[PDB]
Structure formats: structure tokens, C-alpha cells
Design a protein around this ligand. Structure first.
Ligand SMILES: [Zn+2]
Ligand SMILES: [Zn+2]
Ligand SMILES: [Zn+2]
Ligand SMILES: [Zn+2]
Lengths: 194, 194, 194, 194
């Protein structure tokens, strides 16, 4: 259920794994055995980030190992997003819009999944500003218009024109950027990070 | 480079890991030490599936541990597919088409990625035929028309109508099926397995 | 500083991954954009477990995804423990008054590794108490004496008498128990959870 | 039968995953659809490594993805080895005439686990030969005698004298070497690669 119940269970598991009783762990943390027992009873909700770091350190592990997974936001395995629900960020430079990021469905059961419908408002490939590469892989599909894609080394990019209906895979960590094809107005693509 | 060079390297690595010399391994396989040495020199290309199974067995591991990864088909991190390249399978029952699967870009660097543009030709939800669930997660986005989605238990499904622009996530192993909404003709969606 | 600095970096990365600016995230949390900026400037150390849970929730991920890995406690890839250094622990749960845990080297670079010299002071197999299995796999080696091992179904167990020098592998989740062989007084095992 | 039967199942699954019918795959391979059907009916056992490579290639995946995991050699989750059963191996590469490898229990359920009793017959640290590091992590325990360990840069190494009962962790890829301490004749270690 909660961060605190998750932590209570996982803390007890780890403490037992390294064969410490409450007193042994407490002696490493500037607490009483009673307080450690309280954490395992679900009373750790007010522990700070700093405190959690020290707990993980003395237990030879990470805060992540002591906290629950993201959770389950699915309806028997599925989640649906209607179009009007989409979060929207505008990619703006000096009060001029270059991209509109229309956010599609996401889920705590697969946190790396970030699908977007991207409206590409610049058709000047000079405006392409390289990112530093994504943490995960990405699948792209051109919905409207024509895309001018650049990738690799921002000072020596590989480039390609993608017509409507083209699809593309970009591996994790590969820097890239795109605009609409020179003079062609606007384009639209779906980008699925995963 | 090759299956055989990959195998030669990986076989040597595993043999060394379990501290066997050529003679020790050969004595387990009905071969000479010379033949084992030949495999590690790249001469294993004619080994059969059955033979590879026995080699993996005596080395306490899998055929996969002894064979190279899928390979690299990327162009500095990227691969692009033009629309006319798409492989196409028709979902047919008794010479009547129900689905057209239009295959988008794939890569050996992420073999589970299988993106499709799916043309949905049936608009009778009675025609929905449940699969048994996918091995991986799936992201769907309705491109045209309206989809009638069913999921979960084929004898008691959860159901939802997805308008154009709706998006959906279906977790691995969840059985599902879809048609166009009753009487609405045809629909189209993009489905990205990953 | 490690926890707050790592959180600052990972928070920024995730917020950017899901196309939120400071104001967007701030709104979802009921905070100001300046508060979010401060967290990304390393000022998140006093955030509570419960608060971290809410930040993870709105970002559709886990606290683990927003906090750094365990850290590095190795000396150019190695850590050593001298025999005088071992934590000597009485044990936890069922295995306390008749088992002494001499804790061997551990590292945050492999948190699941928990090696122990277990002094086994009970020689009554009849009184052996089953656990409910370990979270990970276990390798064991009989250092001294003779071990009476039991595993599987506590009501109808598999058993083995293991002389000095015997070795064993126990898969994750398999319930088991050990005493010294009947009447032999005591024995010692090295137990390596990994 | 395991290899051919597992291949039959995995081939079918993958072919279906990428929306190919028998004829589609057959064409890509230059075979008939009946040949592909026969493979999916368990008749692939005489397929060569090179042929398996071509099938994997056209299916955009690895041979590993098309072949079964190592298999199960456990007795209700456990495997045991008596001391009389150990393979005694002379060693490989640099570590042969002055090291005896007494191979401890292994399992296909954890193929990376390679535990050894290493009899260390050299007591000249000066002659210690570095490896280039192991593929996985290693835990060690000094069973007998006194070990002189070296690691890191062979030209300017870190070193430790490790009495009986000392324990050590060596991360993957870290070069290292051991002899007995100068003039002490011999020593024994348990080395657990995992
Ligand atoms: Zn991108
Ligand atoms: Zn599906
Ligand atoms: Zn155990
Ligand atoms: Zn080693």
C-alpha cells in the first residue's frame, strides 16, 4: 500500500538478510532498538531522504532496495488514455514555439514508456538542437509531413529525410534532433520511448 | 562476425570458466581434443542443434550462452524503414480478411520491438478472437476510426471503446482482441510490442 | 550529500523524460516551481519517505528510480576482511541460540552477497526448524564436522548427510534447515547467499 | 529431444510474433513451407549452427532466443556434491602446474556459479601471474595457510596478506593473482565465481 508499509517490509527483509537484530541495526543509526522496531511496524513515513541514505548505507544497499516498486495503476493489465487527457509541454525559444509535446498513456508498471505525439513547428533544419541521447530506446513513426532527422555527433551528424509513414528506431544514448523538412511547414510524428 | 566465430569465442570462454582443458571436454562429447580445439578455431559451423544441446549440457549452461547476440544492423545507432518496405500479413478467416498487419521497422539490437500499423477490417465485435497474451508489453494508438477493445478473460472480458487518438498500454501476458466499433466500417491503429 | 545530490540529478532527468517543466511538476505536487528547482539544486535532503512517495507517484515511477545506486566501497575492485574483523551475530528468527553467524565480507557493489561462517551448535536433526526459503540462491560448503540437511516439504523432507568438504546449492525460495549430524556435537558451514 | 522440441516451440512463437506465416519465413530462407512446418513439429535437430544463424537473422533475433534455457538438474531445488565426487582438474592458461582445482557443485539453474577449492602450490609471490579479470564477480575464503593476493595493475599492484579465515570480494574484470605467502609452502582457498 504505502511508502511506509513498503519500507517496513523491505527494511525487515534486509535487516534479517544481514543477520542483524533491532539493537544491532539501531547501534549503527543513532536510534533505539524500539525506533527500529517502529519503522518495521510502519512508522517510518517521516524519515528523511538523508536518513534513508544512511539506513541503506549501513545495510550495504540502496534506498531503492528498501522502497516498494512504482505501484499498479492498471485495470486487469490495461490502462487507456482519451485524447483530451494528454498533458502538453511546448518547446519554446524566445516566445516562439518549435515543438508541441502531446503526452500519451503512461503506466507505473512500465515507467520507461513515454509515448508522445510531437507537433513539429519549425521547418528550418538549422534549428535542430541536439539532445544528449535518451536513457532508453525510441521508436518513431511519421504521422504527417516530412521530417529532417539528424543523429550522432552534433558537429558531424548523420542525416535523413523521413516521409509520412516512415518509421525509425533510435538506440539508447544516441544524440539526435529533428525538424520538418526545409520549407515544408509543419510535420507530426509519434515517438515512443521505452 | 559469424555464428561459428561467435561460438568459438564463447565455447573457449565457458570451457575455461569450468577449468576444463580440451581433453576433459572432448571426453564428455564423443570427440577428440583436436576436434574441440577445431571448434575454438572457428570450425563448428556444421555442428547440429542436437550436438549444440549436448555441448551446452556438459558445460552446465544453455545454447544461448554459447552463441552470439543477434547482431548490429544499425547505422550509428539508428535504423530507418520507408513505407513501401513494410512486410504485410493478412489475418484471414475462410477467404475473408479481418486484419491487415503492416510491419514497421525492426532491429536485432532490440528484438522484442515489433511495431505494426494494423488495419481493422471487421466491425463486428463478435469476431474478436482472443489471443493468449503477448510475451512483452504493448503500446496502442488509434489512428483512424473507433476501436472496440476486449481484454482479460475471453469468457468474461473487460471492454472499452477507443476513439481516434486514444492510446492504451497492455501488460505482458494479458489476453486481448479488438475490432472496429459495431457498424462503423474499418479502423486503423498502431501497435508497438516491446 | 550523496542521497540529496543523486536525488537532485535523477529528479531532473525523470522530470525532463516525462516532458514536465518545473511549474508542471510543482502544480501536481502543490508546491511552487522554486521548491522543485531547489530540490534539483540539492536541497531535497529533508524530504520525507511519504513525500518522496508522492513525487515518485506523480512522475509515474518508484522512489528507487529517483535515488542513486548503493555506492562503491571497493579498493580498485576489491574488498577484503580479516578474520578478527567479522561481525559476530547471534542470528534472527528461529536460528539464534544454536547458530552463531560469523559475517564475512560484503559490498554495496553486490548487495545480495551475504557470506557467513555458520557455527552449528545443535546436533538434533529432529529439532531442526525450517525456514521459508531465501530471497536469492545459496551456495554452501561443509567446513567442519558433519551436517544433516533437510529441505523441501517440512512435513516430508528431502535429507542429506554431508561430511566435511561436501558442497550444496539451494535455489531461491526453497525451505530448508540444518543441524549437525545426530550426536556429533557441532559443525561449521560456509553459507554464501548471492 | 530437448533442443529440437524447445527450438520447435520458440521458432513458432517468434515467427508468429513477427507476423510471418510458414510461407513468408520459408521464402526468406529459400526453403519450402513444409520444411518450416517440420521444424515446428520437432524435426529441426540436424540444423547446423550456420543454418540456425540464418534463421535467427531473418527473424531479427539471436540463436539464444530460439533455443531453450539450460534446464533443471535440481532435486526439489537442491543439488549436493560429496567430497569424493569432485572433478579434480589441473587448470587452464597460466594457472596449471602450481594450482589444483577441486571443482565444487554446479547447476544449470545458475550457470555462472563456479565454486572451487583451489590448492595453491606456489609460494613465490614474485612469480604470481595476473589474469585479465573474470567475467563475473568472485567471493573467496582462505581455507588453509596464508595467501598473498595481488590485484589491479600488474605493474603496480595492490596487495594483501590474507591469513586463514580471511574473505575477499573481487569485482568482475579486475585482474588478480594469488600465491601462498612467501616460503609457507602451500595454501588453499575456496573461490566462488557467481
Ligand atoms: Zn528522441
Ligand atoms: Zn496485442
Ligand atoms: Zn540457507
Ligand atoms: Zn579469481
Amino acid at each position: 500500500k504505502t511508502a511506509s508499509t513498503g519500507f517496513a517490509e523491505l527494511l525487515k527483509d534486509r535487516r534479517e538478510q544481514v543477520k542483524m537484530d533491532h539493537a544491532a541495526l539501531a547501534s549503527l543509526l543513532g536510534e533505539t532498538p524500539e525506533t527500529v522496531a517502529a519503522w518495521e511496524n510502519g512508522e517510518g513515513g517521516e524519515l528523511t531522504l538523508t536518513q534513508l541514505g544512511r539506513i541503506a548505507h549501513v545495510l550495504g544497499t540502496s534506498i531503492g532496495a528498501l522502497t516498494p516498486p512504482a505501484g499498479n495503476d492498471l485495470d486487469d493489465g490495461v490502462i487507456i488514455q482519451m485524447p483530451d487527457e494528454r498533458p502538453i509541454l511546448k518547446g519554446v525559444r524566445d516566445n516562439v514555439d518549435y515543438y508541441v509535446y502531446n503526452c500519451l498513456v503512461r503506466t507505473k508498471r512500465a515507467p520507461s514508456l513515454v509515448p508522445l505525439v510531437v507537433d513539429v513547428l519549425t521547418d528550418n533544419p538549422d534549428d535542430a538542437k541536439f539532445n544528449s541521447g535518451h536513457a532508453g530506446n525510441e521508436f518513431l513513426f511519421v504521422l504527417e509531413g516530412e521530417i529532417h532527422m539528424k543523429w550522432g555527433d552534433k558537429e558531424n551528424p548523420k542525416e535523413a529525410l523521413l516521409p509520412t509513414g516512415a518509421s525509425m528506431f533510435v538506440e539508447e544514448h544516441v544524440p539526435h534532433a529533428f525538424t520538418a523538412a526545409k520549407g515544408t511547414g509543419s510535420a507530426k510524428l509519434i515517438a515512443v520511448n521505452f
